[PDB]
Structure 1
């Protein structure tokens, strides 16, 4: 196993515009196969990256900035990871989805709006080359990645992930740490071969003779953890307050972070932006696609080496010497100036201030069947991706979604376009529900903790519970999607279309 904490943390450069004016900002990003060293003792690794970078460059915009990004495919015609042709036409398809973006439907990166190299071939839902991001939403941590039909888990694992930040000039008065002291942290677990090449399972453990090859796997757990493209890195920090945009860009793995010196995290934001009130945390869970906007005060730890630790297991308990480690902070950098940043308690207006009428209430269940090969096929409400759309909210209206989870594992449920509030969680008799379809609660409703009292777009739906959320579908109408963000699940039909009707 690679030696931990020997490479410094890379800080992705901020992408510079091809053209910019007061009325518009135009960017160009090209997907390319490239090589990068992920660790001091590894040979270079072959990856796929936006502008040839892993992670891709960080994009910074202001609220309401009129942005355009021309995402281009200039990758090889053949993939380098195991493709299962039985779960679903050029071999390499790509489409960029701005996760968390309030985007017009033809710029949202629909799974079937893919395109091959140079846009030679395009999916049935392709409409445009240059994506449009009006950015008329709250300041927040967004991130972009590939979303191609049936290839999402592979393209993302290949390295197609990047951070996107929306800055709301009105929040500047909070004086939160900024600039050099505002650092994004993209966490991705990977398994790397001796030759430095990426390893992605070609099939499940002990493959059945009647199983396809390659064969998609229901989940993926890497043996190594990276942050911003480097294995267990270290970051030199000044003894003061820092802001971190934590992003889980992993296929399956869920993290449960904490600091080994017992220090606290100060959560100031969730997927949807600033929380109404800051929350002191000793630890926090972060499933795939979830984002935590936090402040860490290093002021009193000058000289110390602090480890960002993980206690959540993935396909087993955490290994103290490996996946139990994320990165290491080193409070040894001299202060460049006085720490003028603040860690205010009053961050933003409450979401509950809004009083919307409940137009509809959808009850959805997390299930699945089994294919001809004996493999599990996860389905949202027992429907397949290709079946006729069923989740059809009306633009401008608010609905309550009740997600029933009779499975034995947690599912990070994500809805495109919108941001939503969490109402509560409640346990139920799984056996009963599975045998009679009847839902019987075995305890009271549990309201969300301070962490989920803001706006979320990716939410954890625990096993044996019913999760209720509320969302106002808009401002745009069109064809979008909602799905589990565990890529291995998403690619084998745990994804459904979502039509916001007008």
Structure 2
């Protein structure tokens, strides 16, 4: 395998606006095929990148900043990863979704709002070339990536991901580590061929001869871990507090992160922004699309090399020599200035402070069937993507969604537009539910841990539990989506439209 901790962690440059005034900020980002070296010992890898970069440039905005991004497809007319046409026009379709964005529906990146190179062809829900992000939302770690119908797992794996940070000036007084000491960590697993080329499976292991070729697979587990586009990198840090914006940008893989010197993380934020109170953690789980906003305090570890370690398997136990490792910190950089940053306990209002009447309670079930080829097709509430819309909350109202998971695994459930509160999780009798559809609980409800007492938008629903969340649908109305954020599930076919009605 590739030798760990030999390349420095790249820090994506912050995107500069094409125009900027007090009233408006305007950016242009072009998707390009490009080559980048992912490890000291590899030939350059052919990739798809926003502005030809992997990851894409980091975009930083202020709360309420009036932002426009023209996202353009200048990709080749053919893909380089294996497309399975049996699961679902130009071959190469793209659309950018700002995940976590409180975004008008026609700038949200609907899967059928795709566009081919230079907008020559566009999907039936396409309305505009230049996306509008008003950013009228809490400070938080967002991220952007491709969301094209039936191609999301491939377009994202190709390299189309980047970070987007909203800064709320009202949080400045907290004096959290900032600027040079505030660093995104975009984690993506990949499998890389000897010649440096990306590998993505064209079929499951030992494909029945029934199977089409290529065939979609139900899960992707990469052999190698990359952070900010480099395989198992090191980062030289100063002996002081750092803030890290940790984003799982992987297709399937869930991570369970720790520090190998037994140091703590201080979680200050979740998907939807600052937690009410900081939380000291020795480890945390991070499923696809989740974000953790954390402080690591290197003050007491000068000289040390500390591995950000992973204990979660993907298709099997972790390998100590490979996917057990994420990156390495080296506490050897001289202090540029006194550490004047803080790690405050009191961060933000509780989500509970705000009282809301429950307009509706939906029960949703994670299910599926099997296709003519024998493959599993994963479905939300046994509906196809193309079935008439059933999730139709009213704008301005709050709902509890009760998500029933009788499957064998966790699924990270994501709703666009909104962030939400986690109410509780409760175990149930799976066999009974499958035979009769009757829900019998085998234990009391478990309220969220402190890490999930703030605002979330992507949430782990574990096997044999009912998960309840509370969301206020707004402030915009229109057509959005909800889906599993395991991309191999999302594309076949674990995604549904969501109408927020006025």
User: Into which bin does the TM-score normalised by the smaller protein fall?
Assistant: over 0.9
Shift of 1:293: 0.1
In the TM superposition, what is the alpha-carbon distance from 1:133 to its structure 2 partner?
A: 0.1
Q: Using the alignment, how far apart are the partners of 1:205 and 1:392 within structure 2?
A: 39
- What per-residue deviation string (whole Å, max 9, x for no partner) do you get for residues 94-130 of structure 1? 0000000000000000000000000000000000000
* Superposition deviation, residue 249 in structure 1: 0.1
Aligned with 2:251: secondary structure? coil
CA distance, structure 2, for counterparts of residue 463 and residue 487 of structure 1: 18
Query: Structure 1, residues 389-419: CA drift from partner, whole Å, max 9, x if none?
Result: 0000000000000000000000000000000
Residue equivalent to 1:270: 270
- Distance (whole Å) between structure 1 residues aligned to residue 136 and residue 212 of structure 2: 45
Deviation, 1:285, is 0.1
- 1:218 matched to 2:192: no
Instruction: Please give the alpha-carbon distance, in whole angstroms, between the structure 2 residues aligned to 1:273 and 1:30.
Output: 28
Q: Secondary structure at the match of 1:448?
A: coil
**Does the residue aligned with 1:191 lie in a helix, a strand or coil?**
strand
What is the match of residue 207 of structure 1? 207
Query: C-alpha separation between the residues in 1 aligned to 2:114 and 2:208?
Result: 32
Q: What displacement does 1:224 show?
A: 0.1
Q: How far 1:21 sits from its partner (Å)?
A: 0.1
* TM-aligned CA deviation for residue 236 of structure 1: 0.2
Per-residue deviation, 1:240: 0.1
CA deviation string 1:360-387 (max 9, x = no partner)? 0000000000000000000000000000
* Structure 2 segments unaligned to the other structure (5+ residues): none
1:112 is aligned to 2:120: no
SS state at 2:87 partner? coil
- Return the alpha-carbon distance in structure 1 between the equivalents of residues 210 and 367 of structure 2: 24
- Counterpart CA distance in 1 for 2:119 and 2:11 is 31
SS at match of 2:293: strand
Match of 1:228 in 2: 228
CA offsets per residue over residues 36-57 of structure 1, 9 Å max, x none? 0000000000000000000000
Deviation at 1:487, TM superposition (A): 0.1
Provide the rounded CA distance (Å) in 1 between the counterparts of 2:27 and 2:208: 47
Query: 1:7-33: per-residue Cα shift (whole Å, max 9, x none)?
Result: 000000000000000000000000000
- Supply the distance in 1 between the matched residues of 2:315 and 2:337 (Cα, whole angstroms): 45
Residues 160-216 of structure 1, C-alpha deviation per residue, up to 9 Å, x if partnerless? 000000000000000000000000000000000000000000000001100000000
RMSD of aligned alpha carbons: 0.2
Report deviation, 1:464.
Answer: 0.2
* TM-score computed with the length of structure 1 as normaliser: 1.00
Query: What TM-score do the two structures reach when normalised by structure 2?
Result: 1.00
How far the C-alpha of 1:261 sits from its partner, in A, is 0.1
4+ runs deviating over 4 angstroms: none
**How far apart, in 1, do the equivalents of 2:377 and 2:69 lie?**
35
SS at match of 1:467: strand
Alignment: residue pair count: 502
Query: Distance between the aligned counterparts of 1:455 and 1:360, measured in 2?
Result: 20
User: Aligned equivalents of 2:439 and 2:87: distance in 1?
Assistant: 32
Whole-angstrom CA distance in 2 between matches of 1:73 and 1:15: 18
CA distance in 2, matches of 1:465, 1:449: 16
2-side partners of 1:172 and 1:355: how far apart?
27
Cα distance in 1 for residues equivalent to 2:77 and 2:468: 43
For 1:324 and 1:78, the matched residues in 2 are separated by: 35
Shift in Å at residue 134 of structure 1?
0.1
Shift of 1:278: 0.1
Counterpart CA distance in 2 for 1:122 and 1:208 is 36
1:97 aligns with 2:134: no
Match of 1:460 in 2: 460
Q: What SS does structure 2 have at the residue aligned with 1:207?
A: coil
The structural deviation recorded for 1:494 is 0.1
Instruction: List aligned pairs for 1:274-293, cutoff 5 A.
Output: 274-293=274-293
Give the whole-Å Cα distance in 2 for the aligned partners of 1:68 and 1:421.
29
What SS is found at the alignment partner of 1:6? Answer: coil
